Every structure is written in C-alpha cells, then in structure tokens.
Write a protein that binds this ligand. Structure first.
Ligand SMILES: Nc1ncnc2c1ncn2[C@@H]1O[C@H](COP(=O)(O)OP(=O)(O)OP(=O)(O)O)[C@@H](O)[C@H]1O
Ligand SMILES: Nc1ncnc2c1ncn2[C@@H]1O[C@H](COP(=O)(O)OP(=O)(O)OP(=O)(O)O)[C@@H](O)[C@H]1O
Lengths: 527, 529
C-alpha cells in the first residue's frame, strides 16, 4: 500500500509509454486540442506467468490516487459480473459504466479477462455471446463514453474474441517477458534495500548469473528462504519445544552458504516442462570450454547478433561421430550461454508426447510464436533420426513452412546430427550449404585439457586430512587415455573416485595406493 | 453526440448512402409520385461486415442530419440487449411499448444496434426466452394491422446467426455489404480526419502514404495520426518524461513532419492481420530487381483476365507460372501479384491451412472455401507449389477438387492461380490437361539482366560506401557485377547480406582503404559457387 513506481525493475519503456495515457492529458491539456487528438485510451497486458503484471496496476493506483490531481479507481474480478437473474447479469455492466462516468475521470481495471470474453461461437450458451455483445457495444457505440481508461490482463492472448482487438476498444498490447541478467540485479537491489549488514554489490553481481530461468516471484521467495535457513543454522533446537524461548537477534547474519543451500534446495518456475538449455557441469568444465567458445565464434561469424546488424537465413549444424557427446553435452550449453533469446524446443517427445492434438498444428504454432518474438531460436536435435520417424505429411508441412519466413528476420535453425553429411539423405543436404559455412566438425580434445580433467581429483582430492608415485600414476593414465570417447572418460573418473570413496575411513595411505594401481591396469575400457 | 457530422465527413460509401435517403426523405419530400402507383417503398435495412468500417458512424451521421432539418422525424436506439426484463410478462411488453411510442410520433426510425445478440436463429436445444422474443418481434414487425411508415434498421457484426425468417422482403429486405476501403476511400478518409491542420499536408504526400497503408480498416488510420502526434512530441522535448512536474512549452516547434509517420507506422499492425494474410509487398531491397517482371506478369494476366483494368466478358480464367527451383516464383512473385492486385477478396488454399486446423475434415474446408469464394465473385484462389502439393493429397481429395471445380458457371469470373518448379511436361497428365498452353495459360521466368543487378547493388556499394558519421569503388562494382552472371536470387541476396556485414563491422573506423582492402579480400574470397 506504499509502492510508487519504485519497486518495479527494468520496465522502462512500458512505464514511460504508460504514463502518457493518464497523466499527460491532465497535465498538459493545452496540446491535444491543438490537433484534435483524443489519444488512445486502452491497453492490454499479457505474458508468461510469474512476470509481475498486477504490480504495475498497484503502481498506477497508488501513485495517481495521492497527489495534485485525484483520479478514481475501480477494480473487477474475472467473472464477477454474472448473477442469477437474467436481465441484470448485463445490467451491472451498464450501471458500472454510468457510475464511473459520473465521477469522471476514473479508471476501470479488468483482471483476468480471458474467462470473460471468449471467442463468439454457436457451440456454447448464448449468454456468453450476450455479455460479449453488450460489452463490445458499450465501449464504443453511439455515445463516445469520454474520459475512461480500460485495462485488461491475461496469460493466453489468442483466446480473446477477434472483434475486441481493434483500436478504440483495446488499443495497445504489451510484452511482459522473463527478466534478463540486468533486471535480475535490479530486483535484488530492490528487495535488499532495507538490510543493516548491506551486502556488497559485487557479491550480488556474481549472484545474478547463476539465477537463470528465474522470474520475479522466485527471486522474492529465495530472498525469504535464505534468511530462514540462516536462522535454521543458528538455533536448531527450536524445533524440539512446545513453548516459547528467548532468542537473541544479533547472531543470525546472512552468509554465502545460506544462499547456496537455498539455491540448491529450490527450483525455478519454468517446472512443468524442461528447458533444453542447461549449464555444463563443473565436473566436465575443464574439457569443453574451448570447444564451446569456438562454436560461439563461428556463430558470431554467421549470426552477428551474438544502424542494425543484418543477416540472411541464419542456419548452422553440429555433427560428429558417435560418442563425442555432441548431442547431450555441447548444444544445451550453447543455448544456455545464449540466453536473452527465447528458445523453442521441437523434437520427438514434445510432438508425439502431446495427444488430443495434431502434430502439424503445434508445428505451425511454434513457428508462429517464434516469428512473433523475433529474434529467437528454433531447436531440433538428432536430425538423422528425426527425419525417419515422421510421415510424409509432416515432412511436406515443415519443409514448406519455413520458406515463407521473411528472409531478413533473425531466426536461427540449429540441429545436431551424428552420421557425417555425406551419408545424410538427400533433400536435407540441400538445406545446408557448407561451402557457405553451415557445417561445423567436432574433434577430440588434446592432452592439456585431458590432464586438467584428472589432476584435481588425483592430486588435491587424492590427499586430504581425513606420495610421489601419484605423479607416475597420473602420467600413465594420461598416456593410456589418449583415444577414448567422452563416455569412457567420465566412466574412468567415476571408477577412480569410487575407490577414494571406499577408502574413506582408513587413516593411513599406501593401502589405497595399491588399489588405485590395480584399478589402473585391471580396469580397461573396451574402445 | 456531436453536430459536426453532416454526411460531409464520410468518404468511400457513396452507393450505400445514396440508396439510403431514397427511403426516408423521398416519401416526405415528394409525396405525390409514390402514390401515383401506390407503391409503399421499402422500409427496412440491415448492415453487416468486418470489424470497423463506419457502420455505427453512418447511423450517427444520419440521426444528426435528420433531426436538425425541415422534418423532425423522431429517433431511438436500443443496445444489443437493452429490452430484457426480469418479469416474465414484461420482457416482451417492453418491445410493444417501444413500437407504440414510435407510432404516436410517426414518422420514426428505430435503430437496433448489435442485433446479433438479440435475434439468434431459433433452436430447441437452448432456452425458451430467446425463441419467444424472436417470435414476439416478428409477429409485430409486419403482419395484420400493418406497421405504418416507420423504418427498421439493424447493424450487426457477424451475419449467419440471424433467424432466416427475419430475412424476408418486408422485415429485412435490403442487406448492405460493408467492405475494407480501397485506395481512393483511404485517401479520402485521410483527408477527412486531418481537415483542420495548421500546415496543410501536400496531396502527393497523401498519395505516397496511402500507397503503403494496406489492410488498414477505417479506424486504424484514425489511430495513426494520434500515434504520429505523440511520436513528434516525444522526439521534440525528450526531457519531459522524467519530470513529474509542470513545465513550460513553446507551442511552435511542435510541427509534425515526415519520418514521423514511418516511425509511427513501425509500432503498429492492422486490425485484420492480427489473427495473417497470404499477401506481402516486395521488400525495400528486392523491388528494383523484380519490378519489371511483376509488371510483365500483370500485363499478361490482363490479356487473359479482362477483370484487371457493355461489359468485359470472360470464360474461366486460369494461369500457371513456371520457373526453375531457386528462381523465387513462389516466395517473391505470387505474393507480389496478389498484393498489387488488391480490391479482390482472396482465399489461399495451401498445406498449413489444409492440415493445420483440427476438428474439420480437409475436404470440408476445401468445399467451404470454394463455396464462399463463388458466392462472392470476383475473387482468387491461390494454390502455390503444385508440383509438391499434388503427390501429397490423397486420391479422394484430388477427385473432390477436380469435380468441384467444374460446377462453377462457365462465365463466372473466378480465377485460379498456381505455380510449379518442374517444367510442364514432367507434370502428371491430370493437371497437365487442366492447362491448355496454346491458349496462353503458361508464363515463363527469366533471370534479371545486367542493368537490374547494377541498379540492385549500386545503392549500397557506391552511395553508401562513404557515409561519414573513391576511384576503386567502380572497379569493385564492375568486378562483382560480372562475377555474378549465373546466380539465382538466393545467391544474390546472400551476397548483398555479406557485403553489408563487412560494411557495418567497421562502423567505427574513420579511415578508408583499411576496409576497402577488406572488401577486396572478401570479394575475391567469396567463392560461393
Ligand atoms: N520486475 C519486478 N520487480 C519486482 N517484483 C516483481 C517484478 N516482477 C514480478 N515481481 C513480483 O511478482 C509479483 C507478481 O505480480 P503480478 O500479480 O502483477 O504478476 P502476474 O504476471 O499477473 O502474475 P500471475 O502469473 O500471477 O498472473 C509482484 O507482486 C512482485 O512480488
Ligand atoms: N469512413 C470513415 N470516416 C471516418 N471515420 C470512420 C470511417 N470508417 C470508420 N470510421 C471510424 O471507425 C469507427 C466506425 O466503426 P463503428 O462504430 O461503425 O463500429 P465497428 O467498429 O465497425 O463495429 P464492431 O465492434 O462490430 O467491429 C468510428 O470510430 C469511426 O470514427
């Protein structure tokens, strides 16, 4: 009840263009008559859940209610205008509009419009058509309602009748996406303003990036869970009492461990489906960063969005012999590093994994959105298998549905295959022009990163408080592992760490060093 | 309610306004000819159309004109459902009272706005109240004890769901179609809304503007001007958005100029194509390359299709366009010819529309669309990429399409447009015989000439080469123009894109011959094929 255009983060264009429907005419009424303007007086909010849409309504109400100029405010729920008696289920609307009009100026806030104004059709009750009829005949009929601002909000945009969406009834539509890296530090700055041990800004600076997929509410919830877990760490015996105790509020400071434990304990909201973009694990990290960075360089060569930068039909392909893990370790890292651009999965488990609908419908739909949210990414894994599991109908549908895409739009098509481009079937080899720079060949890592992979486990992790032969073992294992694929690599790492985990309680070494040896020779990969 | 609308500020509807006053004024102004034959001229109207054309606006203008006049015909209006009453016996009685009051002040006009929510087509599956009110209205609108001389007018926004009975010559005997404005109507409404501007805009500027606003529907142009004004103010005094205080303003540097509409237009989409058309204009970059062949296609079509300007008379126009794959005859030509050929209702018929909606058999859609387009000739039917479309459809749909094409009237002017990549001979016999090439039903495509490519590249290579924040440039132009002799359109576009990339990469450098040398290395390095 005290939020005034300060608790919202990153919403600059929308706020700036929002104050110009309700404040400017009252503040500067000497300009609009100069040209007979009557500026637009309605707009619509919509975006994926948990992005903070009702807060801006709070903001306008709270800010404009108190000040030099006083404007009313009304609020309505989704289906609050329906009652039992037939002739008055609509009469309430007329009474409301009159009521607001006689106290003009004012604002009418419609919340959750989607359950109110469906698409008109004859496969339902006639009553919903009655309400939509009188409603759309009331904003702009024959009487020019005057100074009213109507505001609506919903999650599923397309399920609103195509009649309402034309200027005069609902004017503008606004995108409310997930926050980026910038907005995330902004919001965390906002929610930690009133803290005596003020956390260092460079600390929250690294705190920002690991919070991918987070949106508003998740950030707020984490800010509470951290403090709670700190208390949990501080006076743990509080769960074993049926009576009030005495607590000292001077030793429950907040530390990085609490942040980490809360972070690992909780999960982001976008929970319902899995996002095909993930950060590469710390375990494999010192092995593939060079590869990832090289791929990003090539992508920058072809797709310069990594005066306006301009492109023409951006495409690329990641292929390699099986066991290089190019389809389960490499690509999702590339997407995750390229955040700030929405990603749209399209593969076997999403197509056949959704029933009660046709594959072709969703295949058209996803490209529809990706176009509507340019620039964007379309992702399709395992093409050499994918092209064999679909009927001719879908082949035709997909292969014709992308030519109509405007040529200079920024849409990238990214796919991974395993069989080399020579063995791929025709009609797809025409979709990649590798003379252009549309094919990337992956190769084995060399010795340096190989050694870096094992050295941490085999030197420091091998010597802990709860020794020159180890150099020999390390060099031997490096020597023997120069022609393994990835899978054998992490299998070897797991088997090595398993021995340490087993020899945990033995306080004297030179008991497990032998075991390490036998594991070195007795464990052989198959190749 | 304003007094500023006096039929003067309404453009593009002359045929509907004309026949309309022949129903209200003439029975009173000249009440001697109408009784010469005892005619009782018709007393009903009904409106229907797409969202936004002035349907309610005509009603407003008519009431304004009529009341302030020599005759004082009374006026009324009931909203979509304004007559319902909770009492079992008053809901209908409201109607009778309304008509009765209209009778004592006769002559009168009754306007039912959004009749669709009031008069549904009668059915037994739903409530009785609607089925009773529709009866009560019809029994009194005309029957025993004739109404008198009041006029009943009804404007809706979807048409089908009206009881077919009310569509009889004597309740609703004249149905007026309302359509999207053409170019002339647009250029006239654009004058209308800017009737009083301090700098009066130039006519040619209005023509140039009207050429680009396509699909805009009556009120869209209304909103465009307000957007332009706000953009002008925003650019003019930017420090106004961070103040939250009263400021002083000089109301003389606030003039609206060009480049304001262009920025205003980008942040706007039309009302029709918000839920898209299969018609797109050629982009900025491509027009200088294909304008000539678009013109040539139009000329040939006019030769075969007279309706591309007694009366011109036609017999089953058809046309088929052939080009080698990569010639862009299905991604740059057909949309252009549809878009330039405006004012004809068009209905695409392609795969993502066929198998792209559930809960309907494909043959159902195929029959429905053609039935509609026939009912509203003239029109077009668009079937692109036939040489792939054919082997995809099953035999049953093939047969229903082949037969359902031939039940059209022989002289009904309905055009079918289709393109392919394979030459005509390779096509299957069935579609081969639907085309009679000797009649002039097949048009060829050829790659552009030297001048076209030169005019295509020269703007970027030469006039945009310097662009501050000289003799070698023509050499590069000649070299690249010759090096691209057998390239198709995709190659040419990609070449343009790569040139622009390296131009823009050194946006920051101020010395030349450091990116010109680049330009060379890339061009002789650009071994595309
Ligand atoms: N940019 C932000 N800055 C601060 N808090 C935010 C921000 N975005 C979202 N939030 C938080 O998320 C809450 C959600 O607000 P609001 O109800 O308007 O969201 P919504 O998009 O309508 O969500 P829902 O999915 O519930 O409909 C806010 O009250 C606030 O606590
Ligand atoms: N020729 C025109 N000249 C001036 N204004 C016009 C013209 N055509 C349309 N308009 C404007 O567009 C609107 C006309 O639409 P009207 O009020 O008749 O209902 P509608 O929007 O067509 O109805 P619905 O909600 O069924 O789509 C008015 O705001 C009017 O100012």
């Amino acid at each position: 009840s005290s939020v005034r255009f300060d608790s919202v983060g990153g919403l600059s264009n929308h706020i700036a263009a929002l104050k110009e429907m309700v404040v400017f005419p009252l503040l500067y009424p000497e300009v609009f008559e100069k040209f007979k303007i009557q500026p637009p007086r309605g707009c619509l909010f919509y975006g994926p859940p948990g992005t903070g849409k009702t807060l801006v309504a709070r903001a306008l109400a709270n800010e404009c209610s108190q000040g030099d100029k006083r404007v009313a405010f009304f609020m309505r729920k989704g289906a609050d205008c329906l009652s039992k008696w037939v002739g008055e289920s609509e009469r309430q609307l007329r009474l409301l509009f009159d009521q607001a009009y006689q106290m003009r100026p004012s604002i009418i806030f419609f919340d959750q419009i989607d359950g109110l104004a469906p698409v008109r059709s004859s496969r339902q009750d006639q009553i919903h058509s009655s309400i939509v009829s009188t409603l759309l005949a009331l904003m702009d009929g024959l009487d020019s309602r005057g100074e009213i601002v109507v505001i609506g909000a919903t999650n599923r945009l397309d399920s609103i009748d195509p009649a309402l969406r034309r200027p005069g009834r609902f004017d503008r539509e606004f995108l409310f996406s997930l926050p980026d890296k910038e907005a995330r530090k902004e919001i965390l700055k906002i929610h930690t303003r009133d803290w005596n041990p003020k956390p260092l800004d460079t600390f929250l600076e690294e705190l920002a990036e690991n919070c991918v997929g987070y949106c508003g509410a998740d950030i707020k919830s984490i800010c509470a869970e951290a403090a709670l877990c700190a208390l949990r760490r501080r006076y743990p015996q509080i769960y074993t009492t049926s009576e009030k105790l005495q607590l000292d509020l001077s030793s429950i400071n907040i530390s990085a461990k609490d942040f980490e434990v809360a972070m690992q304990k909780m999960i982001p909201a976008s929970r319902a489906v899995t996002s095909p973009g993930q950060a590469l694990s710390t375990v494999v990290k010192p092995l593939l960063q060079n590869t990832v960075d090289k791929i990003l360089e090539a992508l920058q060569r072809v797709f310069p969005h990594a005066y306006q930068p301009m492109s023409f039909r951006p495409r690329i392909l990641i292929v390699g012999e099986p066991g290089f893990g190019q389809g389960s370790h490499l690509a999702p890292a590339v997407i995750h590093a390229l955040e700030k651009f929405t990603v749209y999965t399209l593969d076997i488990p999403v197509l056949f994994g959704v029933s009660t609908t046709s594959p072709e419908e969703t295949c058209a739909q996803v490209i529809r959105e990706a176009k509507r949210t340019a620039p964007s990414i379309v992702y399709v894994p395992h093409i050499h298998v994918w092209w064999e599991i679909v009927g001719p109908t879908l082949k035709a549908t997909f292969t014709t549905l992308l030519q109509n895409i405007p040529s200079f739009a920024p849409v990238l098509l990214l796919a991974t295959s395993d069989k080399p481009h020579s063995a791929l079937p025709e009609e797809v080899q025409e979709l990649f022009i590798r003379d252009y720079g549309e094919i990337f060949n992956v190769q084995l890592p060399d010795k340096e990163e190989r050694t870096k992979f094992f050295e941490d486990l085999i030197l420091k992790q091998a010597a802990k408080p709860p020794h020159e032969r180890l150099k020999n073992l390390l060099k031997t294992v490096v020597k023997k592992s120069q022609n393994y694929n990835i899978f054998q690599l992490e299998n070897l790492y797991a088997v090595i760490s398993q021995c340490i985990y087993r020899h945990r309680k033995d306080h004297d070494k030179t008991s497990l060093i032998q075991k390490m040896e036998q594991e070195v020779e007795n464990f052989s990969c198959s190749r």
